[PDB]
Amino acid sequence: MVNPTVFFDIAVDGEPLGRVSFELFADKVPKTAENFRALSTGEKGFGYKGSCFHRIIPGFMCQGGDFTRHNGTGGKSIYGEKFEDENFILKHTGPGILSMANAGPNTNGSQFFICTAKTEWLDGKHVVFGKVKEGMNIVEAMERFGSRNGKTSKKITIADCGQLE
């Protein structure tokens, strides 16, 4: 068993920026890691390709994963619309942590965020399931288009994504 690695190719108003790859901790949170892995390959017939990062707050995080409404209100899991908080073993310890957005206990869908700082106030409330493995410099580049209120100044999209390993 080896944890899966998936990648996103990021574009800024259609111009390629670069590739970010992620290691998913399927050994600790198998169900949450599976959900993100299948949405990155698009194998259930829907997923992250073509979707955008709709909320980026510099020094905090980049949020995305709404492939239905595209505006921060949608997305769904591969298990139905929402699923349970699998566990909170891992914490939001620094830059590069991959975690699930939600609207309270047991409401995980497809929306996720990549932390650019330690955000310990989300520990025990948001399930951590991966980390940036390569491409942290592309995540830093993405922050330049965010704002204190979250609106981005450019359209940041997942031009392509898939599983590497």
Binding site: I57, F60, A101, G109, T119
Partner: peptide, 11 residues
């Protein structure tokens, strides 16, 4: 504030 929610985004 600094939350990451889906639906009602708070301060």
């Amino acid at each position: 504030x600094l939350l990451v929610t889906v639906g009602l985004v708070l301060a």
